[PDB]
């Protein structure tokens, strides 16, 4: 595999996302770290599929809604940022006010 330190770091984000994903499934209102991990992991798989940066900056705002997270959480996340390997290399995706 020859995993570099960054690929190993993203495995942490992915695992954190599995935690949140399971909880959302039980119908829990996600907390701060859970929300971030869930939306961040969404975008990474977006890049893997080959979606463009512009497409993801939009879709990222429709992952979790205000009624799916705890009180105060949406305001604690003014934006979400993550980088992934798109077909044209690493790119930065910034999703503004992901939770509405």
């Amino acid at each position: 595999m020859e995993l570099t330190p960054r690929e190993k770091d993203k495995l942490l984000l992915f695992t954190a996302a599995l935690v949140a994903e399971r909880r959302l499934a039980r119908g829990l209102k996600l907390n701060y770290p859970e929300s971030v991990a869930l939306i961040s992991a969404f975008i990474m798989e977006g890049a893997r599929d080959g979606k463009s940066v512009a497409s993801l900056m939009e879709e990222g705002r429709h992952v979790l809604t205000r009624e799916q997270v705890m009180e105060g959480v949406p305001e604690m996340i003014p934006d979400i940022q993550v980088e992934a390997t798109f077909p044209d290399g690493s790119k930065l995706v910034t999703v503004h006010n992901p939770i509405i």
Partner: protein, 101 residues
Amino acid sequence: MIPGEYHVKPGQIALNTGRATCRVVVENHGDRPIQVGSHYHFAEVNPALKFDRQQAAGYRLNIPAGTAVRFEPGQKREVELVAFAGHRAVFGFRGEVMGPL
């Protein structure tokens, strides 16, 4: 309930009070845009901005600290300047004074 929320009381803040000011009409004669900072010695801005440099001596922009005023090519506008304080010693910029005044 919003974690860490502010409860700013309503009203306004008066900036740089009790200091000499003056208005100056500035025109950008350059072909490229120019943006000036709040604490930049106005008298030493880009040479393409046309104005009475003599009046802007030892003055800076009377705008909230950290903000700027942009000038698109050919733009003309009146700005308000406020006098430098402290030691009134200007060092740097275009190196036109490099000392007190």
